Write an enzyme that holds these catalytic residues in place. Structure first.
Site, PDB file in Angstrom:
ATOM      1  N   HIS A  26      -5.289  -6.168   2.722  1.00  0.00           N
ATOM      2  CA  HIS A  26      -4.328  -5.110   3.070  1.00  0.00           C
ATOM      3  C   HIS A  26      -3.892  -5.277   4.508  1.00  0.00           C
ATOM      4  O   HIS A  26      -4.701  -5.117   5.422  1.00  0.00           O
ATOM      5  CB  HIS A  26      -4.953  -3.726   2.892  1.00  0.00           C
ATOM      6  CG  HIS A  26      -5.314  -3.412   1.470  1.00  0.00           C
ATOM      7  ND1 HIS A  26      -4.895  -2.268   0.830  1.00  0.00           N
ATOM      8  CD2 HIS A  26      -6.067  -4.089   0.572  1.00  0.00           C
ATOM      9  CE1 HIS A  26      -5.375  -2.253  -0.401  1.00  0.00           C
ATOM     10  NE2 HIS A  26      -6.088  -3.345  -0.580  1.00  0.00           N
TER      11      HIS A  26
ATOM     12  N   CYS B 172      -2.271  -3.399   6.173  1.00  0.00           N
ATOM     13  CA  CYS B 172      -2.282  -2.135   6.891  1.00  0.00           C
ATOM     14  C   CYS B 172      -3.688  -1.929   7.465  1.00  0.00           C
ATOM     15  O   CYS B 172      -3.969  -0.911   8.086  1.00  0.00           O
ATOM     16  CB  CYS B 172      -1.883  -0.968   5.984  1.00  0.00           C
ATOM     17  SG  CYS B 172      -3.202  -0.411   4.956  1.00  0.00           S
TER      18      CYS B 172
ATOM     19  N   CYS C 109       0.856  -1.197   0.000  1.00  0.00           N
ATOM     20  CA  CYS C 109       0.000   0.000   0.000  1.00  0.00           C
ATOM     21  C   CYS C 109       0.883   1.236   0.000  1.00  0.00           C
ATOM     22  O   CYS C 109       1.842   1.328   0.771  1.00  0.00           O
ATOM     23  CB  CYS C 109      -0.959   0.025   1.206  1.00  0.00           C
ATOM     24  SG  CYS C 109      -0.333   0.386   2.880  1.00  0.00           S
ATOM     25  N   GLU C 110       0.598   2.188  -0.872  1.00  0.00           N
ATOM     26  CA  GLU C 110       1.440   3.356  -0.899  1.00  0.00           C
ATOM     27  C   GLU C 110       1.343   4.146   0.391  1.00  0.00           C
ATOM     28  O   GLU C 110       2.223   4.957   0.687  1.00  0.00           O
ATOM     29  CB  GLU C 110       1.116   4.245  -2.098  1.00  0.00           C
ATOM     30  CG  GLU C 110      -0.249   4.896  -2.148  1.00  0.00           C
ATOM     31  CD  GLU C 110      -0.528   5.523  -3.529  1.00  0.00           C
ATOM     32  OE1 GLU C 110      -0.089   4.925  -4.550  1.00  0.00           O
ATOM     33  OE2 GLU C 110      -1.191   6.592  -3.608  1.00  0.00           O
ATOM     34  N   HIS C 111       0.313   3.881   1.188  1.00  0.00           N
ATOM     35  CA  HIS C 111       0.130   4.623   2.418  1.00  0.00           C
ATOM     36  C   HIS C 111       0.979   4.212   3.611  1.00  0.00           C
ATOM     37  O   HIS C 111       1.142   5.005   4.506  1.00  0.00           O
ATOM     38  CB  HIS C 111      -1.337   4.620   2.788  1.00  0.00           C
ATOM     39  CG  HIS C 111      -2.219   5.149   1.706  1.00  0.00           C
ATOM     40  ND1 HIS C 111      -3.467   4.608   1.461  1.00  0.00           N
ATOM     41  CD2 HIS C 111      -1.995   6.171   0.844  1.00  0.00           C
ATOM     42  CE1 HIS C 111      -3.974   5.309   0.463  1.00  0.00           C
ATOM     43  NE2 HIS C 111      -3.127   6.268   0.051  1.00  0.00           N
ATOM     44  N   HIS C 112       1.487   2.979   3.668  1.00  0.00           N
ATOM     45  CA  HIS C 112       2.347   2.564   4.782  1.00  0.00           C
ATOM     46  C   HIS C 112       3.340   1.543   4.335  1.00  0.00           C
ATOM     47  O   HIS C 112       3.993   0.914   5.149  1.00  0.00           O
ATOM     48  CB  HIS C 112       1.586   1.979   5.943  1.00  0.00           C
ATOM     49  CG  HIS C 112       0.179   2.414   5.986  1.00  0.00           C
ATOM     50  ND1 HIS C 112      -0.366   3.245   6.942  1.00  0.00           N
ATOM     51  CD2 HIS C 112      -0.800   2.193   5.075  1.00  0.00           C
ATOM     52  CE1 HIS C 112      -1.625   3.496   6.560  1.00  0.00           C
ATOM     53  NE2 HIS C 112      -1.914   2.869   5.422  1.00  0.00           N
TER      54      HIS C 112
HETATM   55 ZN   LIG Z   1      -2.154   1.284   3.908  1.00  0.00          ZN
END
Ligand SMILES: [Zn+2]
Ligand SMILES: [Cl-]
Ligand SMILES: [Cl-]
Ligand SMILES: [Cl-]
Ligand SMILES: [Cl-]
Ligand SMILES: [Cl-]
Ligand SMILES: [Cl-]
Ligand SMILES: [Cl-]
Ligand SMILES: [Cl-]
Ligand SMILES: [Cl-]
Ligand SMILES: [Zn+2]
Ligand SMILES: [Zn+2]
Ligand SMILES: [Zn+2]
Ligand SMILES: [Zn+2]
Ligand SMILES: [Zn+2]
Ligand SMILES: [Zn+2]
Ligand SMILES: [Zn+2]
Ligand SMILES: [Zn+2]
EC number: 3.5.4.16
Lengths: 221, 221, 221, 221, 221, 221, 221, 221, 221
Positions: free
Chosen positions: G179, G181, G110-113
């Site tokens: 995901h 995350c 995930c580009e977020h974490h």
């Molecule tokens: Zn994420």
């Protein structure tokens, strides 16, 4: 014209250990069509005390159906005239390890409320001088099953009968079943099952043998 | 031009142990095209005795089909000219643990009614001097399965043949099968199945070995 | 004393549509016990042709066992004297939505080799004037199952029989089976199954109904 | 002190559509205890006709347990004095999509042999003004199940009862069950099960809705 | 003595549609014992080029084994002398609904690397004048599967051949398979599988028919 | 620039025990790109012998694709220049209980026909001084898998390699696989699988340890 | 020596619809071993701000492993130099129905974490003038997967790329993934999965086509 | 205001046995927010080195989310200021048989690549004087999991921690997990999983006990 | 009129071993409807502190329902006035192996938060002189389960209560449940479950017997 060698043998053995279903002598020779009409008579009475309208196309014949079912079907195991014919071949193959018959269909009735018992039976024995026809085990099982029963007595009867017909005490029986008188009424437990097992011979005495068998029992489909 | 080293070895070993299939001497040299037509003729009569109309385009070919199925297919195991070619390689890997071939397909016939038996075999051995080709085990199982059988006898034949061919008593065979003459007719039990096993050498004597094999048996898919 | 209203109605509907099993008129009143021995006779000849020792304590009743099984059991559906009794209550509940009996047990035999067909049936109908006894559906299915069959024909026969007895064309039948002559021999495919279906009336003409039924088919346990 | 609004309303409804269980006016006010003792009376006669030794400590209380079970349990839905207490909140949430309660446990009895019927129910409705408590649906279903039933009627009763107590015709009911008088006796089919569905309102008329409901039905665990 | 009516029909139909397998004219009459030894010789070289020791008792026989596997087994589908004998009976049952043979075993080879393809085919047709023997479908599938293939081509061949033989465009074929040259090497994906389907006649045009077939496809055991 | 410490150690251990793959010394430094073309050359000849049109846009790179796959992919384990790099941290955590890596993916090839072997491995060891990187176990298993194998040999090789690298005899390996040369051709058994196991040290001598490991084997997903 | 025809085409197409991963020009030509040491430098810093003891035998190499993993592995999809080589055969088989590739293994981040995304991809397209190598779809999928991603963008990129390489807009992609995350931190939901789907061409426009595909997606093993 | 008894005790224990996660003295009191901003600092550098456009609205907050995740979540067990609050009731019930908490959700990170580790834990202990609250076991397990781990060490830490806080050596711990740095990168094994167990007290010494625990471990849902 | 023989015996036995649920003397004779009402008020109190508008046509009844629930239902096992009627029969069947009741439905509440506990119980005993009615065991279990509980105690209670009514130490109990105070709040673990077990007599001292029963436990449906 009355009973069969095997049927006699088993019945004697069962009374000898005092494991027969609690029966009474038939007193006097009463016809089966008489017993059945008498029984439908009582069923008509019960059905009326329930306020059912026996005039109905669907209800009218129930007393007689319930009567035939009791005598001819679900309780036919109380009359040894119905015992199955047994066939046994000589153990020329010299089998000396256990033979097992798993997941034998078994439907019976609890003597306490005459409600259904659905279950599975696993039977194993170690051939000695003779080998029994495989279907015969299924039939001997269904026979004792067609009697008002209590699961512990049922399991034991089967052991004895097979022990008697095979000529060895090296027989084992395990039954896993569901009692609708526990599921459909009363405590209404929808998930429990009861398991009873009778072990004769080496199946009881010899630890190693005892577990090969117990390890094999329980084959859910 | 008749039989092969292995075919004859195996055959003798069975007769020696009194485990061969109940056979009679082929009397006079009868050619298979002749056995097939004679057989075909009897099925023609049997079907007529059943009131079937052999003039129908679907039933017409059935007597020749059944005869061929019997002689070339499902009972071809009764003729050792069909024994499988065996191939053994030198145990240079020095394997000294058991090799298990599990879930071998097994289709056979009940000798009591000539009805399908459908089951699975699990075979194991511990290599001494030679390791056998894996496919050969399956093949040996099908050969003895292509015979009118009794599960208890079939189980032992596979054993004895394997011991003989592999030069070891350290072999074990287990068969779990369904008999359609129990399911398709008679008592008509849709769920029971029979398990039979035969153990040789260490698989019998060593409790250790024996339970390792039994533990591994029964791999439903 | 010969045939019953239901039976005769069914047999005629099938003949009219050309879907009865290919049968040749008996000819002369040949006694069933006579048929069995002639059949058992030919089976004996067949077994001697395979070189089996009919003198064996296990192979001796075989010819006799087969004869009885063919005539009395697996091909009993060829004699309408065995058509099941039909019970039909009037549709007072005014049911106008399909009733579906699924996973009906079905064991049959192929007519190309007389080998076991093991499958499952799902029947459905939209009651018109009468509702039928649930078990009769089962009983009707097994009646036609006990005949050398071709799955395509078997499915049609059950449709006609039911359409006839219930006075409606709104019936549907689907059969899902495994043929051992495909599995146990020949191509030896161990995973294929065959599905056939026969849809009458609304089940055939109405898109809506047709799919409601097909959607509800194939209930593997 | 006799009946409640809910019950009288449901009762009238079933009677109006000709869907009430076939009942006869009590006639004279017989005290439920007398009824039970009379029923237990006749059951004792029956057990004596089956030759069971009622002197046994296990069979001793059976006629009285059966009597109590019949009147107070498995057949208690025959008396509307037993109808569940209904609760209805105001549909403020403005729910306009179906609410579906699936796999409602349902154990009933067939009226042809008084044998166990074990199944599952799936109920859906589209809230209009009132929104019934969830568990009530479970209680209503089990109310009509505690009667000698016919699956086709039981399904209809439930529908009608809920349409009435809810204020809409938008109610759907589907039951899927195993009749033991098919499984444990007679044809003895160990695998079949019967599915009945009753559709009201949009569930019957609207194809979109009809299939949204049918799509969701049949959640095996 | 060369080819058969059906074999040639099918072959032409493929060439006509530009769907045959990329083949070249056998130039001069080459006998199979000769193709096998020549092939064997190349495998001998290839194995030497790999530094394997053909003097080993396990590897020694491999070149002759591979050559035989190629010519008689896995690629035997390239020679129409191996086409299966087809048998068609008259559609007297007047079947007019689709017959589906599902889960046909399918083992094949990827033509890009000569690596195992393991999958299952589902085939369906609607009978016109004739009904084909069920086993024949399986057989036809294996024939075209015993060829270096590309799943997309293999799928169409089965179709066209079936149409041709059955005299109908109303046939449908679906194949779900695993390619080991995707799983065993290269990207090395242990979980993907490819599904391809080809529909003829009504299975293409009638949305109704088409979705009934597709709906039924994918019967994982 | 030739071999790495680990690689050389492993190759020697195997040679000493006589478990290396049967290999003949290269002889002369024949360049890999030269090998591939010679191989690709013979593959071309083989394909022309099967009558395939190598001029096809789909069959043209095949000979080349096979050559590269054989030398670079599925048989890369024959060249120790491809032995995986080994990383070993010191056992500070003082782990003294077996670590088990299960369901390790394993795809290989049989040496009798060069056909796909698809299986699963379970490795276990009792760390002594060093703990190995988890993925190295995987990597070691696949290294030996990429070689024409015999499952019995394959299992031993993995044991020796691991025993060698970890400085202990306390290692155990079990492989459960499906051989396509059994499944896809020949006897064509679609359900059998083969299990082999190699136990060192405690896994072999200690009853307690041996069973803890065997008990933990065969984790089907 | 920079990029490939296909790689270029795809990259252009992706920027044209403005669907490329948000990248920046590499500014100046910086070596990959430089980027990697720079990246390990920062990882050493982060690891120290966590108070880990980089002196440890196990931790010491982590900064460099994390560095190679980012550049060479899990993010290698950001550099089109890594795009897969594509092969396409001409559609001579004239396939005109959809080809589907189900359960394609797919692991992303995930580009977020920068945490793991485990999922499965199903891709279908309708061949036009060319047929793509099956493994190529798996490779194109894994390519876009090796980039910091957001599931919705990922699904769309794949559609476009395949659309671009196949020459039709008739392509469909569905992804079902997990995901970590969402599972391992934050809300910590252990059971949810997300499903995204991109439909081009007839897969988007034509209702019938749209559902055959959606009906096929989701094949849990 | 620093640490609690529980934590200091556990901490000392791990350090004493040389099983603490390799940590360096903080050195100087750095404010956790600075730490995070420094970490987020370096992550920004790294994302720039991967050429990602941090100006994008989605990638904009990533370095700060990673920083927060690292310090406050996935690696929070590195600071004992985060140890769970322990509760211990008095063992009045006199429990003397093991208590087993199975399938504890465990998500950790491997310390070689900081990639996701997803697994399950099974913990058992034999109560001496104190009986810990159930959920605490879940909290302790997840405490040590929130650290860059090595499955072999994580298992030991948990054991030691619980033995300490419980007062007994009678504690057993078994973890079964999937390392994504094995599954999503490198060897890319999609199926393997690793099992580690740590046994203390009777669980190590007593065979009866040891196997009672091992027997129960591995409850897949 | 207060308590029954059994009830008294069990209660004493519990107090004697000090395993009774912590209860304070009622003090003064307070009517139930009074307790219910006092609890109701305190609820109305709490619900007002939660800010819930009690004026709502649906929240209204809640304090009164929670009122009824605690006293009349879920905590009813607190009042032995509720112990179930026990019925025993003579062990004339001479049963001497264990009788097992599995998957008994068990719904409790944790005493730490009064939150739902949902499990399954397995009870076994080796009959001595009396044989308890099966349904009773279920009843006993739900009784102790109807109390604010701590799993470790509940298990212990069920054991003693049974050893007392059966007159044997040979009783065993296993409970496997999920605590929603661990799943729906706090650590929020959606997958863990707890197992506790108590062994009496031979189930504790006989290794063999001990393991036979433990091997049976855990029958997930
Ligand atoms: Zn994420
Ligand atoms: Cl009761
Ligand atoms: Cl029989
Ligand atoms: Cl055939
Ligand atoms: Cl009936
Ligand atoms: Cl490739
Ligand atoms: Cl072979
Ligand atoms: Cl978040
Ligand atoms: Cl690695
Ligand atoms: Cl807590
Ligand atoms: Zn009962
Ligand atoms: Zn038979
Ligand atoms: Zn056939
Ligand atoms: Zn009935
Ligand atoms: Zn390929
Ligand atoms: Zn091979
Ligand atoms: Zn790692
Ligand atoms: Zn709690």
């Amino acid at each position: 014209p009355s009973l069969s060698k095997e049927a006699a043998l088993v019945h004697e053995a069962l009374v000898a250990r005092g494991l027969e279903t609690p029966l009474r002598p038939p007193v006097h020779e009463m016809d089966n069509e008489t017993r059945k009409s008498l029984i439908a008579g009582h069923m008509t009475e019960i059905m009326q005390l329930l306020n059912l309208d026996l005039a109905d196309d669907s209800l009218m014949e129930t007393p007689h159906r319930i009567a035939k079912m009791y005598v001819d079907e679900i309780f036919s195991g109380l009359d040894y005239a119905n015992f199955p014919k047994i066939t046994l071949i000589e153990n020329k193959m010299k089998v000396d390890e256990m033979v097992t018959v798993r997941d034998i269909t078994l439907t019976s009735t609890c003597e306490h409320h005459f409600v259904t018992i659905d279950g599975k039976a696993t039977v194993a024995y170690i051939p000695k001088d003779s080998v029994i026809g495989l279907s015969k085990i299924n039939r001997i099982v269904q026979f004792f099953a067609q009697r008002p029963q209590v699961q512990e007595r049922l399991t034991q009867q089967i052991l004895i009968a097979l022990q008697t017909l095979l000529g060895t005490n090296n027989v084992a029986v395990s039954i896993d079943a569901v009692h609708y008188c526990v599921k459909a009424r009363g405590i209404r437990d929808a998930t429990s099952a009861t398991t009873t097992t009778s072990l004769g011979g080496l199946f009881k005495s010899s630890q190693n043998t005892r577990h090969e068998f117990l390890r094999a029992v329980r084959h859910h489909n």
